[model samples]
Target: KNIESLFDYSAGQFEFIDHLLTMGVGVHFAALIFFLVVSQFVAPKYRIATALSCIVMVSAGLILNSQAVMWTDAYAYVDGSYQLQDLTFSNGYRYVNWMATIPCLLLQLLIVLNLKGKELFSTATWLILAAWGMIITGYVGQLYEVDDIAQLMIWGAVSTAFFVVMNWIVGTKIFKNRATMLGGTDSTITKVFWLMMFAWTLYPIAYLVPAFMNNADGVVLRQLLFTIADISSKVIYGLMITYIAIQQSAAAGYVPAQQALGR
Candidate 1:
């Protein structure tokens, strides 16, 4: 019963155990290949960038996982008495922390170089910029290891800038024009479209929030207002992406409609 109790655990743990325990090293490589294939199919133009980003993220995750494996080995060697596991885990995670910014920077370059247009930046442009800005601020906060007023201000500015640009994309005529170009109507259905566009925007603030404010921080306090604003901004921005993707898909097929439905 003691040994069984030690072994029997949550369903979630079982799933992880099945994947990691059974598959072992094969799982990581297979996941990377799958990520590349699927992401390439979705957007050929950005496929390489997406694949690179995935590789970086997975590499960092693997490093952290390796540290856990090392700790477990140590526990078995020393009768589970010496708990340097925390120290190893903490340092391992800390080193991988900087990897969070690699994708964000890649996204920034992707937008500024590939997605920008003469008249104005595309929806993709704004989202990439916003996410990159937020991630940059979050990374800076982490690098300095100080959660003081200056760090807060940097993150606040980044969050605010993203919210403003994304809000403009959601509320302004630009969003509708893009929709129209993609053969999607500017119907109320487009209201939730922003989500598809900016899925990564909220993650920065989510990670940064703990550094700035306590759990009980209030919205009306103004001090934490940026946090509140960040939530709503990400929600709306994510919807925009969904709408845009659907619209683009439809528009790419609109010519058949013109031939069949036209008077």
Candidate 2:
């Protein structure tokens, strides 16, 4: 009730949201082509990482477009400011996007790490399950964000429990496997791990915005935050994995990749 409902928005506020979302769509799709182009230099075995990046960007492009359309349709422009219309705007699509992309992302990391057999199977399963729990719990909290602060906070905390589990799995897995990684990319893997953790940390902060700002201003800030998180976590993280895979390929004596990387 409280979250996305908006009766009016100043022209600048509305315009900012509109432009950011529209541009996000373009940004993601364009990045898909970027992935396709760079993947040429990657080793054949490690190319799965870049392939997954293409999937992420495609999903991102679609969801950003969906969100922008939802934003405009949910509001009417009449007499000075934008007004809420009969349609309700929901961020449910974002959760859907996360559900689609996050698992792909986690898998990309594990694959790049060259994890194999039972160990990889078990760890990957747990990570996916934890992420799903996190998304569902957070989604419920988002439903109460505007009207019921207590419900929002409680569900959010539960969601955080899942987040904690996810982090634990990632931390333990990375620490355990970093030494075994190939291509001298272990250090790079560590860096990207921290980068991803930092990026994901912003999501809860953005989700909790209504508890503090609780207005159109907060909504704008949340969208802005999400845009940052989405790009950093998915696109930037994807690229970093691509780099690691390429490095591994070169080390595996893919002569062309070695030549390109000057390794």
Candidate 3:
């Protein structure tokens, strides 16, 4: 009787796991298509940025889906719950995806923002470092076992601090400094940045879901919420970037290659 019950539970968990993977894959593919379409219309100077963003999104999706499958197999359904061999709290693959893609997302914005020389490179460097800091510390916290709640709290606070600082710098200092003619600041880009920031704010909340809610149901919720956040941050945000680029390019009298040839 016990063996049969366990088997049934495992099967159910597998179904849920597969569903999560499917959603991740679909979201990523859509993001890739969106970026590719946008790349053709953006100005030449910014074309590479969009192209790289598409590549990073593709990598993120592949890594996320692959990791989800690996994580599902790494743990066992014990006593109606998933159990890891070591003391890992959650799957690290998500963090890995973030580490690679967050910088790319920021790069896309920075390139479109059109900061020059030291200003551009320095800001990009710091932001990417901060992003890695946030993810790495958070990953450390998640490695704690059930009894190490204090460790999780401490690491969570550290990650939150990093997030706050990053946003403050990007929203206030960076925006103010770069919101000039050279930085490509216009009403369209400004609005795009604002919307992007709003979308970004939801991420930390989604990140906290795993820490506060720890159950099978919580797992599903976390996956769903993070999936939503991911699509917003990468796909929707990328579209806005494209729109801003096109608008700014047009305003500057940028002629597309074929149009230029005709003239």
Winner by lDDT: 2
What lDDT score is found at residue 43 in candidate 1? 36
Worst 10 residues of 2 by lDDT: 1-10
Model 3 per-residue lDDT tens digits across residues 1-263: 00111122254665676677677778788878877875776678777677866877788788767856675665677777565543332456677778888888888787777766898889989998888898899878766624476777788899988887777767764457455533244555666667667776666665555467665655556566666767777777777666666655655666762353244
How many clashes show up per model? 15, 2, 0
Stretches of candidate 2 off by over 4 Å are none
User: Deviation in angstroms for 101 in model 3?
Assistant: 0.8
| lDDT values, one for every candidate | 0.39, 0.86, 0.67
- Report each candidate's C-alpha RMSD, comma-separated, in the order given: 10.7, 1.5, 5.3
**Which digits, one per residue and each the tens of the lDDT, describe model 1 over residues 79-131?**
42232222232222432443353334334223212343543345555555655
Across residues 46-152, which tens digit of lDDT does each residue of candidate 2 receive? Answer: 78789999999989888888888888988878898888885557887788778878899998898888887797789889999999999998988888876788999
TM-scores for all predictions: 0.40, 0.95, 0.79
lDDT of 2: 0.86
lDDT of 1: 0.39
Query: Lowest summed-lDDT stretch of 10 residues in model 3?
Result: 1-10
Candidate 3 off by > 4 Å: 1-17, 71-90, 177-185, 257-263
